[PDB]
Symmetry: C5
Subunit: 206 residues, 5 copies
């Protein structure tokens, strides 16, 4: 306990706050989704509710330490409020995202962070035909709201969404689920913005 | 990072807080909307729900810096709580506005700020006739709640609402969507208050 | 900018915080309502939902200043958290009040304040007969929760509720709307408590 | 203003906070409910929604002062954050409590406190037979969540619930309503816990 | 009062806060559930709502004291925000957990802690068949969200869920309710994570 107390004191109390990524010092956030459930569908408003967790990985030099100097500590769990986190935002959401898990990140000696918030999202999705064989396809872009590609780039480990925790007695079955890097442009800003497009094909069980 | 850390420290912690606009130092805020979706309509309460994001823009001398002095940093991203934001409020809302995006702005070396919050708004609107060819028109005014035209004026870069991000499989389609400056008066106060009137015509697809 | 920062620092940072009204130093608060909309009715729970804003006026010696000392500043806007605000509560509410506007007040050189929060309220009201010619009448008392008539007194500038911003295409029309000072006694306490009673008569249009 | 400012600073800023009651220094809290409305019933989930306020009363030596030393001030209103308050909880709630009033207590020179928060509670109650002449009976225990009888005891001035502010046009009329001290035991702990059982008889009118 | 004030000051004001467990200094948290009510069942979305409280227990050396040094004080109540608490999370929830009790822990002189928050939980569960005699079985895992078995182990004092405070007039009755330790692996991480699997069998009475 005593060695970790020193480490956290040395990293946070002394040091000034990391101001976020820049053009000169850009960052790459790795994103991956695990789908737990499609909970609800609203055919009158075209809203659909997903329950999932979103694995986020990035790396900062300012969070580095030498394990010999702090009793062989290679990593620690700390509150997400203590560190900077990327502003990863669903682009077609219809409600504020509901937080389902503790906001605690794992920081490792090399400066790499792992942060996995569990979320419930309501987003825009036409569910007409969900009760047929073909099913329906819906998409939602996840990316930084304010940082362009020149400050925050994104990537995935795999293009396949993790469905090994998907609820087996859900009212919907997943036919496919993919997560793909995209480049988009918007009216505000001349520079490109990056997102991870979550494309989920699904239908009712029988 | 080191030069930006300095810049943020020199702007916020070093200085006293900007008290907001006055009649002596008036401010002009540019507004623009991009309508993403008309999510819901309630014919029994005359409430309609919009999802959009609102491009806000203003300029303060107190947020200026010489980029030469801070490693050629022309601009930076920062939390909206670190700076003064204008109090742009919907005048015919029926619920608290639900925030859908990060509250983070972009500040540039000349003092100019850009801030684009995503919002869900429930507002007063009669949807009777939306299931027809002619459809229904509806309006909501966005302006400062507490500052008059002598302290905060508004303008638009375009009268046309950006519909390029409108949900293609929405239950309603937009026939027209405009954003226009207005001048209004209210009982409390003798001086004129300014707003941008968002007028949307729509029907069932 | 410079003289207003000074003024706010001299009023707020310098002084110890105003502890509120007392029997020795009492305070009168003027209330006026402007009704925007009767949004919803619920005949299964006897709840009705209003949307209004509520003009609150009062005056403190501790908020006085001389404009000649601070560059001829006669008034300013500031956050409601920077000052004491009266604890004006609806006595028959069924849900927590939903705030629809920024919490920013206006303060004038003579120590007077103006604060006008927009609110959505769910309150106790039986709407049985709203669909008839005669309509229904309902009432809600607005007053301090903890201060008596010896500390906080209330009055109205007019007994007529302002209906000039009422929603023209509402599901309900207003037949009458009044705001009247009352004196009430309660079981806890020996001393009288003051309220303004909002009485509204309405029907389906 | 000056004498109250001194008093509050001497009570609060001067001393370290009260750490709650102990076995050595026990504390008795007087509870009393005034029932305003039975708002809703759900026969499919057996939940019932009450709106009420709750008169809490206790006495601390550390809140004592001599009125001669502070300009004859016998009492004052102060924010409930500034003092310790008892953790009185409903033992069969099905939703978080919704706060309907400001959180302000009245403190008196002999160390006694009066705190009366207004609340909406959803709690467990089978409403089958509410549409008959006999109606239904439903109970809810109010007590400390963490303090036993050795640290917090309870009592009532009267066992008759205050119905003088009950809503006359409610969906349900109250036949009777009692509030009675009780001792209980739980699995965690060997020591007795105290509650006031709020028993309410009602029916549709 | 004076002796507890010293104790809390020596434990909390002096010390830097406990930084959670590590691989080199692991921690065992004992969990126990008491089910009060199955409030709601939703057969269209396969969500079910439980009301319960969750007895948590653990022991830190940093929370130890000698009772002879602080006037024979063997234990005390204090806010959960003053100390570290485990991040015990329901793994198959569909809404944010709703807190129904005060967040107050009981600390004892040997370093042991007892913390019993009451919660309402919406979790994934197919209720189809609940109206039969066989009923339905449903399960939810409770474990740390971020700490593995190397940092946080779990256990139970009994395999049986406490049903002695289960609501007698609930729409559903409990056929069996158990709480069992399990080991799991997840895609992120090579190391094993511990949970207590709450398995509840139930039907309509
Ligand atoms: C760290 O690891 C080394 C082995 O490389 C060992 O000698 C030492 O005792 C370990 N622990 C600490 C606290 O340094
Ligand atoms: C800033 O840019 C100028 C030329 O435009 C260059 O000479 C100077 O080295 C730059 N400064 C830094 C810190 O990179
Ligand atoms: C300020 O007000 C005084 C008194 O009305 C007036 O005579 C003077 O011109 C004003 N001066 C400035 C600097 O505004
Ligand atoms: C307090 O009240 C008494 C009444 O007997 C009065 O004579 C005295 O002047 C008062 N003192 C102060 C300080 O208010
Ligand atoms: C603690 O307990 C002992 C034995 O009962 C007693 O004699 C002593 O007075 C107690 N301590 C204090 C400070 O009262
Ligand atoms: C700077 C900023 O907030 C934004 C930048 C571009 C990406 C999207 C659309 C508008 C908004 N978020
Ligand atoms: C000063 C203030 O808050 C206001 C000024 C005028 C505009 C509207 C109506 C009343 C309120 N907001
Ligand atoms: C002091 C206090 O809180 C109160 C005073 C009287 C007015 C109403 C009823 C009881 C409560 N609020
Ligand atoms: C210590 C504590 O919080 C408790 C003590 C007994 C009373 C009820 C049931 C369990 C819990 N609240
Ligand atoms: C690192 C972290 O937060 C996690 C670790 C494993 C347990 C579950 C699944 C993923 C997430 N929570």
């Amino acid at each position: 306990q005593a060695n970790l107390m020193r480490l956290k004191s040395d990293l946070f109390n002394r040091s000034p706050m990391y101001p976020g990524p820049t053009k000169d010092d850009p960052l790459t956030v790795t994103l991956g989704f695990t789908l737990q459930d499609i909970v609800k569908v609203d055919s009158s408003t075209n809203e659909v509710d997903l329950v999932y967790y979103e694995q986020q990985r990035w790396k900062l030099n300012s969070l580095m330490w030498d394990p010999n100097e702090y009793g062989n500590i290679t990593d620690f769990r700390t509150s997400a409020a203590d560190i900077w986190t990327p502003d990863i935002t669903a682009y077609s959401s219809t409600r504020p995202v509901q937080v389902l898990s503790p906001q605690i990140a794992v920081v490792t000696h090399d400066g790499s962070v792992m942060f996995i918030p569990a979320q419930r999202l309501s987003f825009m999705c036409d569910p007409t035909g969900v009760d047929s064989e073909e099913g329906v396809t819906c998409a939602v872009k996840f990316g930084s709201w304010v940082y362009s590609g020149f400050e925050i780039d994104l990537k995935t480990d795999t293009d396949q969404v993790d469905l090994s925790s998907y609820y087996a007695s859900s009212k919907y079955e997943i036919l496919s689920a993919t997560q793909t890097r995209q480049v988009q442009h918007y009216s505000c800003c001349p520079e490109p913005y990056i997102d991870v497009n979550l494309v989920v094909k699904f239908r009712e069980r029988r």
